[PDB]
Design a protein around this ligand. Structure first.
Ligand SMILES: Nc1ncnc2c1ncn2[C@@H]1O[C@H](COP(=O)(O)O)[C@@H](O)[C@H]1O
Ligand SMILES: Nc1ncnc2c1ncn2[C@@H]1O[C@H](COP(=O)(O)O)[C@@H](O)[C@H]1O
Ligand SMILES: Nc1ncnc2c1ncn2[C@@H]1O[C@H](COP(=O)(O)O)[C@@H](O)[C@H]1O
Ligand SMILES: Nc1ncnc2c1ncn2[C@@H]1O[C@H](COP(=O)(O)O)[C@@H](O)[C@H]1O
Ligand SMILES: [Ca+2]
Ligand SMILES: [Ca+2]
Ligand SMILES: [Ca+2]
Ligand SMILES: [Ca+2]
Lengths: 331, 331, 331, 331
């Protein structure tokens, strides 16, 4: 009788089971919350696989009586109290590399959608707008702007942020980044300008894109205060984490025109709806349902890697055998 | 009393008049056809400014009794019989450089919109789709594909085509082009692979993008025959000219899935409508109303350049003074 | 009995003969001048292969009594009177693509050799210089300069020039070019700045590199006059043609320090010697013996292509069958 | 009376003193070894500035009776026992960013010097070689190779390594790297392939370039064993640290042709001489006297930064105030 591993917030384990067949019994819960988890898993689950639709607090984690590893199928782990998980003796891991370029591609797509208004232009044709003269073109496409010379400010200069920068350079962007945790000179290897503070980044950027994890020190990084530091008519793009932005502040900025447009793949409350929330009636808003990460090859890659990480934890020694443990310090 | 210059298919001459004030009387016609042009212009117009919403055949041009220059405010001139215009002693000019990067940016936006489905994903949220689980994400975003390793086939390797290639390289595309008029070795300077025939390009390309003018030899370049030469599930993008594609052929390819998606800024009949035409009910279609060229700075640049070209023709010697005459041979 | 083809200024025909065996008798002359060509070739040679070490004037070409094609094994043809050759009914062809990237790589090597002084630094160690302290390093390497922010001015924006630009961009150069024959907007497709005149290019460039053919209108393009228009302490690089530079002017500029250094793969009189010529005692000079074009694969590629061009001329119709005829107008 | 700071292995403190004037007395020793340091500095020196020409062992550091900070004017600190320095309560710092791009430029210069033989070709002309025929060009330039398609293997994917990769991509290199300390996915952000082991890197690379620090685990990383794992006729470039290569092994590889050429800015014993050492008579060797880092702007930048770091240590709290302390763990 092998250890039990549970896919907490999902139903499909097809990609994982060929890797774990002779290692662990695999069950799933399709649970949005811990309340919806059968007590068989809580008391006996040795490992857990998990996406982004369930959050595990210290109280949620204290209900598990035998869990020793949690593997987030994906890069971000802000939905898990990793320090409490470490206190309780539970290793938390992630899969960081699978969707780096997918997300950067989705990001560039949203950046170009703002500067070129292709998505809004398509809606206008879906809604029946007639664009016959060169002069109706200019009106319907009003706001489309030349990209060369514009300044793109990247918050978070890690893997995805650097992929964004590389792509942005080819379109003629002047690319800056702000990352207060990187060592001196990372800007030089890649031929970019770096700034010391968020205020400087927002001050100089016509378009601000977010590419940092959500941690204890940057909740609502974009807030009513820091939004006033953004250039008039600036763009905001967020394919990182919804909790990084105060949507109430953003909603007002868009309504008053202080921000000309925003493209958001993530939101404070998901799933997102154009009928519920602070952006209920905000203008110049493009939204995708947390899909910037998804490609068929990326989805398979991350699930196979996560399954292997579970295998390494069961058959090996924690945390030495793990390749992407994110709470070694708290463990 | 100065020579008369007429903005044929438009109303706004504000950008042009400061340049032409002391050179020519400036009138406009706001005419979609030659039938709608007041006979005062036909008999006395010495020069003409024109966009893409009116076509001038040999018969249309023979109605002008004093015209000696036509300046297309824009790069393409397929809407003017340039060889007959030259026969009749009328120089035809264009403005090629103003929207090179704007169009390449719109093109990359449409390419990424197909590979990432951001525009379709936004529609699904506008239509009320609920995307709660990781598993509804995969379904709603089904078709989104990893770009690295994919092959982008560029038809037409001129200014816009080369800007497309440069940008595409940064996303990991394998970029080929087909241009049967360029000299030997242009592929080498830019680090790209070139193919000899359209069939080869379509054979190897997962995504085909068009960046050639519409001339007498490539009407319906993409037709029922050449569409069968495209890879199964390939992408098509067209920000060049609508006449290059047989939409009846494309409509069927999209319906049967031989082409997974198409992004079109231009169409056989403009203005485009999702309710009229061969693509009335075609799936996986993204459309923009011939706006890939438009930025505020590009629109001003092209109009000022065209006004200067008109000035050079009136005050100087034709065709020696013109900087962008496109029918010197037929003149 | 087949037509005779002669390798005029060489001995080795090994690469060409498998292609021409059943098409033409192949002889060689190893001749630096026409005076050294056996009269059998002059009177009967139907085709000719040729490198850069022999020049054919109208008088040289009038000695051939049956020649109908000349194929330059290489890109440049300034050593052939192509217009007189056309008058006499002789097609002249070249092979332009084989060494585009080789030359751009040699160019970047010479550019970096000037900015980094690696070649001069190696000489100093060959001559026995002792570099022990950080302070002898600065002295021996005195002149080495930071590249980011420097301006590279490209004269000639064709295949090699554009390959130079692409590479130069990655090192942080600000790249301009001057090419008075290209159409409007070529700078935009590639994300570069263009200037109208040679004076402007030389005015703004810290390092000037030449990548244009030698034609009737740019002999001694760099002369005593235009050298005074160069920035103080500027760099000059020439991998194009020696006839483009007045070496007497350059020698003085280097001696007086108006030019800090020059890297030359070509020269007014070849073969080059550090003991003969106007640069006999010029300082800060790096020289290579007209080898910027050479790689093993490039040398084979060009010779096979040239052999095929000869084959096409003998077995087909001139000039219709030729792929790289450079005097179709004069023919 | 202020604290004393000593430039140990140098004489020039001009750039540093305006920053330290009112903070510390500044003396210099111009010492290649600790034996040559006046005892006034040993007993009273509170801080130390230092380049790469003196090494400080535990025994050297134990002679200082009041030293509390050492600042290496430069990136590498392999010449300082940092762990013993930390044991003795001495913070060790460096200046990492000043010469990132200078070194990458020197590296690319040496890489191109090998592939293009420009430096060797210039020597041949200095030695009087006559290169008249196309056929003497091929012989004298024999070995010059086409770069597109070649594989560049980077050992060490930090700041300089990544700058090397970016530049190398533009020349057509296929760039791999090996860095066993970086997290999963760094290769993806930058569009490169990564390998797990040194053997794999050496196996696939036509040209191997070193860009890692010298630490306790990679002395003689390139040794007689690992040299046999290099591809036949491969290139080696080293602008990092001389101690990374067994020159006896390299000397033999070059003599037998297993390595076609090597470009070395650093060496096991410096200063380097072509008359002393294991490479006394090694062929196909290019050498520079540890100058890859030097530009005028880089030299000033690093000295001002180091002076500021000394100022921060004297006027602030160690190690909290330091911006580039490299032994916080051992302190
Ligand atoms: N508040 C913040 N502001 C800017 N950058 C941040 C912040 N928090 C984290 N980061 C950076 O975001 C990056 C995440 O990269 P990755 O997780 O590899 O995509 C890291 O370089 C972090 O240092
Ligand atoms: N039928 C065709 N197929 C491929 N390329 C074409 C065709 N017709 C024209 N072109 C090319 O399209 C390019 C137009 O570039 P531009 O007008 O500068 O954007 C030129 O390089 C033409 O040679
Ligand atoms: N005097 C000149 N100044 C600047 N560019 C020139 C000059 N003469 C020729 N060229 C350009 O040099 C380029 C040669 O390119 P290629 O022969 O393809 O390497 C062409 O673009 C020419 O227009
Ligand atoms: N033995 C080694 N093999 C490969 N990479 C190494 C080795 N030792 C250190 N490195 C890497 O070298 C890089 C140094 O970068 P930097 O000091 O920023 O130029 C870091 O990424 C290290 O992980
Ligand atoms: Ca703006
Ligand atoms: Ca596909
Ligand atoms: Ca200078
Ligand atoms: Ca080789």
């Amino acid at each position: 009788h092998m250890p039990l591993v549970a896919l907490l917030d999902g139903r499909d384990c097809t990609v994982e089971m060929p890797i774990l067949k002779d290692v662990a019994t695999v069950a799933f819960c399709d649970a949005q919350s811990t309340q919806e988890i059968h007590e068989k898993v809580l008391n006996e689950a040795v490992g857990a696989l998990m996406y982004h639709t369930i959050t595990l607090t210290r109280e949620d984690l204290e209900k598990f009586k035998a869990l020793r590893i949690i593997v987030r199928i994906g890069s971000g782990f802000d939905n898990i109290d990793i320090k409490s998980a470490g206190d309780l003796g539970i290793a938390v891991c992630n899969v960081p590399a699978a969707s780096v370029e997918e997300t950067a591609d989705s990001t560039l797509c949203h950046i170009l959608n703002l500067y070129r208004r292709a998505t809004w232009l398509h809606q206008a044709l879906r809604e029946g707008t007639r664009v016959q003269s060169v002069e109706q073109i200019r009106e319907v496409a009003s706001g489309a702007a030349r990209i060369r010379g514009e300044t793109l400010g990247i918050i978070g200069f890690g893997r995805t942020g650097q992929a964004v920068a590389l792509r942005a350079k080819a379109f003629g962007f002047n690319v800056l980044f702000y990352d207060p945790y990187l060592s001196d000179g990372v800007e030089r290897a890649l031929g970019l300008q770096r700034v010391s503070t968020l205020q400087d980044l927002l001050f100089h950027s016509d378009c601000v894109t977010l590419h940092c994890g959500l941690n204890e020190h940057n909740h609502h990084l974009i807030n009513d205060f820091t939004v006033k530091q953004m250039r008039q008519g600036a763009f905001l793009v967020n394919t990182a984490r919804g909790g990084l932005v105060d949507e109430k502040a953003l909603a007002q900025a868009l309504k008053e025109g202080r921000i000309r447009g925003a493209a958001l793949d993530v939101h404070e409350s998901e799933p997102f709806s154009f009928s519920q929330g602070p952006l209920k009636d905000a203008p110049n808003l493009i939204c995708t349902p947390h899909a910037a990460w998804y490609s068929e090859q990326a989805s398979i890659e991350m699930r196979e890697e996560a399954a292997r990480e579970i295998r390494r934890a069961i058959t090996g020694r924690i945390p030495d055998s793990l390749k992407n443990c994110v709470n070694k310090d708290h463990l």
